[PDB]
Sequence to fold (456 residues):
Amino acid sequence: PRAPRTYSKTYSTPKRPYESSRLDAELKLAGEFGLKNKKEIYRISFQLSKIRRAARDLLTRDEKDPKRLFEGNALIRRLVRVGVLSEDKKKLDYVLALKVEDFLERRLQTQVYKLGLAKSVHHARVLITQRHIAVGKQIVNIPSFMVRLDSEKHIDFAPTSPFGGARPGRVARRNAARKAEASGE
Amino acid sequence: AKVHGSLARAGKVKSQTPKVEKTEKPKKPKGRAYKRLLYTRRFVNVTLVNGKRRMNPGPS
Amino acid sequence: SVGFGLVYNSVAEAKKFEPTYRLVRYGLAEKVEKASRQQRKQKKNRDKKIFGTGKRLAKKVARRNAD
Amino acid sequence: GKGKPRGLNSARKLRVHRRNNRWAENNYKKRLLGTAFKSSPFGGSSHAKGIVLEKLGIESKQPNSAIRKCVRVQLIKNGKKVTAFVPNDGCLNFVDENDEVLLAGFGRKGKAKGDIPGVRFKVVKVSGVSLLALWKEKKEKPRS
RNA sequence: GGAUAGUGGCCUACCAUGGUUUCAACGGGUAACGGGGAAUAAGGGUUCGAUUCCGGAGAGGGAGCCUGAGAAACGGCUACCACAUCCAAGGAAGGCAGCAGGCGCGCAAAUUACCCAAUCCUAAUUCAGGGAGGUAGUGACAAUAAAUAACGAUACAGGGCCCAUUCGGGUCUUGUAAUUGGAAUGAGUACAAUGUAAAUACCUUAACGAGGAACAAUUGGAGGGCAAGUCUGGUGCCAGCAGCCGCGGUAAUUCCAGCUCCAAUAGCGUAUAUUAAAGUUGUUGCAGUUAAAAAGCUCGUAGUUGAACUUUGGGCCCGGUUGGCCG
RNA sequence: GGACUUUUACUUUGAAAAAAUUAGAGUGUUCAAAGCAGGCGUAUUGCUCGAAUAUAUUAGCAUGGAAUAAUAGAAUAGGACG
Ligand SMILES: [Mg+2]
Ligand SMILES: [Mg+2]
Ligand SMILES: [Mg+2]
Ligand SMILES: [Mg+2]
Ligand SMILES: [Mg+2]
Ligand SMILES: [Mg+2]
Ligand SMILES: [Mg+2]
Ligand SMILES: [Mg+2]
Ligand SMILES: [Mg+2]
Ligand SMILES: [Mg+2]
Ligand SMILES: [Mg+2]
Ligand SMILES: [Mg+2]
Ligand SMILES: [Mg+2]
Ligand SMILES: [Mg+2]
Ligand SMILES: [Mg+2]
Ligand SMILES: [Mg+2]
Ligand SMILES: [Mg+2]
Ligand SMILES: [Mg+2]
Ligand SMILES: [Mg+2]
Ligand SMILES: [Mg+2]
Ligand SMILES: [Mg+2]
Ligand SMILES: [Mg+2]
Ligand SMILES: [Mg+2]
Ligand SMILES: [Mg+2]
Ligand SMILES: [Mg+2]
Ligand SMILES: [Mg+2]
Ligand SMILES: [Mg+2]
Ligand SMILES: [Mg+2]
Ligand SMILES: [Mg+2]
Ligand SMILES: [Mg+2]
Ligand SMILES: [Mg+2]
Ligand SMILES: [Mg+2]
Ligand SMILES: [Mg+2]
Ligand SMILES: [Mg+2]
Ligand SMILES: [Mg+2]
Ligand SMILES: [Mg+2]
Ligand SMILES: [Mg+2]
Ligand SMILES: [Mg+2]
Ligand SMILES: [Mg+2]
Ligand SMILES: [Mg+2]
Ligand SMILES: [Mg+2]
Ligand SMILES: [Mg+2]
Ligand SMILES: [Mg+2]
Ligand SMILES: [Mg+2]
Ligand SMILES: [Mg+2]
Ligand SMILES: [Mg+2]
Ligand SMILES: [Mg+2]
Ligand SMILES: [Mg+2]
Ligand SMILES: [Mg+2]
Ligand SMILES: [Mg+2]
Fold:
């Protein structure tokens, strides 16, 4: 007899099982941004579809309708806030446009590579997941973080690990221990 | 129709195909890296284009 | 690390407003340990079957040792 | 305006007319009559575990020519007798009479599968250890 | 009038003949507790709700009742019925649809563990009690995030490209490589402190902890629908596959395997149901000459439906909310 | 306060409207499913934003409309006003 700890799922799965075109395009997307699943694509296209839906429902209301104004704006300022929606096209008919890549480009996965720092979307994966890089002094290790535009400036290696000082790490310290134990005494 | 046919031969062909054991082969990468492998195999450097494209051809 | 702290105006006020597991935790009170939970319960349930002091039933059972 | 009453207060006639013609839908009729529970060897349930009576060699239908290795099974909740296929090369070696098998449907809503005449079920487990594992050899049948 | 806390055929006495029904009474079925709700996403719908909240009902089946503000109570009594326990054979006792735990049933579901620290509840009450409730154990029920690798160098091979009278390789890298190179990390293990009622895990973090013999990804599939072979070996209408169309009787693109390959991936197959596809239930929105389907015909009650016409036209004022051109 | 009034359907707006659920705003649970937090300094003696909004229909209530549909009226005048 406790409150239901509510949940929902975050992806949808394509109606047509075997569409070469869609499998080609999806694959290119995994090899472009360094994803491991078709789920990582499905999940984002699920977000896009719930957005596009609300966008359509709002667009059918009258202009200057109180709900259309209140919720439409919140959605637009929300999409601008993370970096999917450009400043120029800032009036929900572009959110009705949009596409998956605009969402993909904003992942901490893709940003850590984007301003150097990695020079491989995969080196970007392994770096993030391995506790390097952060935003504040706050480490994040989720490839799908999505860089919040105004924290783009704070993508650096973290106070810990190599690449940002503090230590080399038990690999290199083992080798330095092999030099100090073999060559000397 | 017939319901009491012979039953001796049940399991025949599996029992008389010659056992060939598997072959020890390079370990294939799991997860994202495998997708990478597919991407560079299917799109980056390409393979043949004999008329169009093929994926599992033997001798051609 | 983010926690929570209380500071009392005296040490009698802490000893009297604090959960007795924190006084145990710090060094300001013993952990008076007792029987298991179902142990005490079972002692209660035993003790429900007796009406009165109980020594009277020892002496009445003492007469059962003969016959 | 052929057939249906179009008017604004004939919702009664339209409802009833729908009710009546739902009965011509074979799956509405099944669901409402309770056929699931009444006929059918399973209870309506998804599976049912029974006992092996005898091992049969059903001859397949035309234009195929085979012997289809099955088992007559008597359901534990029904005592109903049911002839069930033993799938994959071998496997009829794995059963034996009086054994305890888990029959499942064939995936055709009733109805016999391919050329196996009048077999509407298939064996999924024997002796609690599942054909598949035995066929490949991941498992081994219990002692007795 | 009696009875009830009280209205009332609730009950009794007298009196009447009424009440319901094709706008479906009455009866039968329900593998029926009702609702908040759930699944399915053009819409209209279809299906579902034993189950975290609300209401109801029950405590093996019936009835009866004591106590009391409140029960027709069952972790209360009383009787019967059905179960069923102990015995010294005289008797006496039990009611898990509470917590755990067992048998049974089955396709189908976990510990006879810890605590009142929290949420709240009760008493004479700050304190006592609480299998309410919380903690852990079992737990791939559903849901979330997402490791299984990242980066150089070298050996040729290229595709580039300037030049080509012609050796060609040299820079910018595409990468297939059976020697290489140092880097990185938690999975685990584990001081410590954090955590907690006490624990256990998580978040922290000393010491450890990756090179192919791992710390080694799976589940189906590769004739069509349907994404991937006409490779090799086997069998020879057999064994088997095959939702469906169909494969197998000696060069099997469907079987048994090896190789390679495809799809989804810490998940994937199967069965049963249901929803979509389904405008194959059609209100939206079906069809009925010959494919399924107009009653042989006419009357006709319920039902559905039902021609036009009754203050229209002109005049005046008042104040709003968008939008323009200026601000 | 007295005296009387033909009946409806439709639509409008509004009240009465549990929570969780759905839709949805805000908030960087490191991301996410969630949760309803949280955010600022003099971080030695406090300052502060929140915890929205929507749907919620059929019936009943309450108000506006008077098109479209019904209904009643005066013909053995037992009609209307005074
Ligand atoms: Mg570290
Ligand atoms: Mg106790
Ligand atoms: Mg006592
Ligand atoms: Mg018929
Ligand atoms: Mg039929
Ligand atoms: Mg038989
Ligand atoms: Mg009364
Ligand atoms: Mg009568
Ligand atoms: Mg009558
Ligand atoms: Mg009827
Ligand atoms: Mg029932
Ligand atoms: Mg129901
Ligand atoms: Mg319910
Ligand atoms: Mg039930
Ligand atoms: Mg009530
Ligand atoms: Mg029982
Ligand atoms: Mg009772
Ligand atoms: Mg009770
Ligand atoms: Mg009886
Ligand atoms: Mg005696
Ligand atoms: Mg129990
Ligand atoms: Mg009980
Ligand atoms: Mg209890
Ligand atoms: Mg289960
Ligand atoms: Mg159990
Ligand atoms: Mg408590
Ligand atoms: Mg408990
Ligand atoms: Mg409990
Ligand atoms: Mg566990
Ligand atoms: Mg592994
Ligand atoms: Mg290490
Ligand atoms: Mg290794
Ligand atoms: Mg395989
Ligand atoms: Mg194909
Ligand atoms: Mg055929
Ligand atoms: Mg062959
Ligand atoms: Mg095939
Ligand atoms: Mg093959
Ligand atoms: Mg799937
Ligand atoms: Mg449709
Ligand atoms: Mg049909
Ligand atoms: Mg309509
Ligand atoms: Mg339409
Ligand atoms: Mg049709
Ligand atoms: Mg005809
Ligand atoms: Mg005719
Ligand atoms: Mg007739
Ligand atoms: Mg008319
Ligand atoms: Mg006018
Ligand atoms: Mg309203």
Observations:
- Residues 9-23, 25-34, 40, 44-46, 54-59 of chain B lie near RNA strand E (CB under 10 Å from a C1').
- DSSP finds two helices and no strands in chain B.
